């Protein structure tokens with residue numbers, strides 16, 4: 303019934319994402335997941351000012367085993383989109399921790415690793431940070447059309463009824479920005495690529511921007527109803543090394559996310575997102591975040 | 602006028618960049634002036650960040666930029682303990698610290714834009730203050746660090762001569778093995794450090810082993826402490842490499858070297874007990890000139 307604490311929080315400045323494969327028997331994830339959510343409650347009690355939230359989510363094969371094939375009807379392994387333009391790196395477990403304090407997130411990440419122990423093989427650990435003026439590292443404001451407030455975010459992200467009530471589908475994809483390539487583009491060119499102006503963050507009218515602009519690729523409607531998602535993405539990386547956006551989105555329907563990916567990567571109309579001129583996705587996975595009561599009923 | 606990153610206390614986050622000079626040493630002259638101007642711009646834009654930064658130079662490049670004048674104690678970081686403390690001496694150190702990691706990141710990008718392809722970045726470490734100002738080992742870090750601008754200036758900043766306003770910097774990245782630490786009982790970890798873990802109380806010098814960290818580094822010469830200004834912070838990922846990025850400033854390189862000779866077995870043949878769970882993997886000495894000296898880089 304109860305949603306996991308990390309799906310809905312807004313404005314968190316820091317996050318940690320851990321993606322891992324299952325090394326042993328899948329049944330090891332049952333007690334580890336219960337221990338971890340108990341650990342999250344302990345850290346929320348110890349650091350109330352952190353406004354800590356976390357999510358434990360599962361890949362298709364593992365979730366089919368843990369659920370006995372019941373529910374999560376849209377869950378599947380992340381496919382390769384655009385025949386390869388969006389790679390697929392589907393793992394078994396996703397742990398997303400977000401709060402106002404990176405140091406508290408770090409302790410929670412250590413608790414997650416202690417709980418799962420050697421049952422998992424960590425493939426990725428990314429430390430996200432909100433950058434100046436809530437900008438992506440490209441220099442464009444991120445966040446503007448993201449669903450706002452608990453009520454609307456719950457409507458978009460949280461499954462309303464049935465066996466999966468309180469759960470959500472998660473999509474994660476790490477992008478590597480080439481800022482030298484971006485800086486070769488004039489600001490008019492970068493704005494036509496995104497579909498919003500850079501300094502003032504004003505939307506460029508849909509009839510004035512290219513159909514390849516990011517907003518034209520992802521602001522999708524079906525008979526006038528927007529295919530909304532709750533984004534929790536953040537910048538990550540080092541200034542001298544790899545950096546970019548760690549894309550993360552929650553939705554009550556995996557469909558909304560998939561339609562945006564088919565659009566961005568050329569599968570819908572043969573055109574692809576103009577942001578591929580300076581950044582590329584290097585990982586990709588779909589996961590199912592059960593409700594807290596469902597995690598308690600894993601035993 | 603001292604560089605802004607030496608003296609600030611209680612920084613929440615830092616970025617350290619260590620690099621080698623690829624191009625001409627003269628490219629570091631203009632780049633350093635641009636960078637200190639960028640730091641002043643970021644301090645004006647983000648006053649709440651309490652942003653500071655330091656540009657410091659390795660022995661060979663500082664001898665060229667200074668014409669061999671001053672910085673009498675500067676030298677390439679040697680290995681200590683015949684190898685226990687490795688040496689990775691580079692040409693340039695950029696240290697950025699503040700209350701806001703996001704501001705540090707913009708300043709790091711400005712540093713890389715200023716130096717451009719004249720440098721080869723060897724290391725970039727993003728430090729974060731952990732819960733209760735503890736090191737990742739779980740011990741509080743900073744208790745006996747000089748407190749207040751007056752005392753920190755006395756310890757870190759050169760008082761007179763050509764180098765007035767400058768400071769010597771030492772950086773050393775440590776990689777913690779928390780599995781090895783967790784195999785130790787809390788009393789055994791407490792005798793290794795020389796302070797109690799939860800309460801952070803000093804264990805009397807006559808009660809703790811001479812190998813305890815405090816016994817290795819709380820050194821006195823005729824009753825006067827060999828003080829240093831530490832700016833170290835935890836770093837890393839929970840699943841990968843993590844530890845302490847050690848950073849210290851001192852008006853005399855001597856104080857730092859005496860602590861290293863002690864920790865790594867060169868003084869009395871005994872080594873720091875912390876080597877049971879953590880090890881240093883980089884090491885370098887740099888000279889941080891005063892701001893007036895950076896302006897005069899001609």
Ligand code: HEM
Pocket residue numbers: 438440442443444445446447448475477496498516517520521531547549559562563577581
């Ligand atoms: C390099 C990676 C990406 C960057 C830099 C990026 C950047 C942005 C920016 C600057 C905006 C406009 C401000 C806003 O409304 O939040 C935006 C909007 C959006 N992005 Fe992305 N994005 C990225 C990847 C993605 C991906 C992979 C998806 C979905 C699969 C996505 C879905 C959205 C949605 C739904 C919107 C809101 C569009 C609207 O309704 O106006 N983005 N993105």
Ligand code: HEM
Pocket residue numbers: 736738740741742743744745746773775794796814815818819829845847857860861875879
């Ligand atoms: C793994 C690396 C290290 C760890 C985990 C570590 C940890 C600590 C801790 C827990 C304290 C006690 C609290 C305090 O006064 O701050 C301390 C004190 C100190 N450390 Fe370290 N330290 C490390 C490396 C070093 C190094 C390389 C040096 C110098 C070369 C150093 C010099 C000091 C000094 C001067 C003190 C204050 C001692 C006193 O006057 O009581 N530390 N360190």
Ligand SMILES: [C-]#N
Pocket residue numbers: 444445533535549
């Ligand atoms: C889009 N973020």
Ligand SMILES: [C-]#N
Pocket residue numbers: 742743831833847
């Ligand atoms: C010691 N830090």
Ligand SMILES: [Mg+2]
Pocket residue numbers: 447521
């Ligand atoms: Mg719209």
Ligand SMILES: [Mg+2]
Pocket residue numbers: 745819
């Ligand atoms: Mg003492």
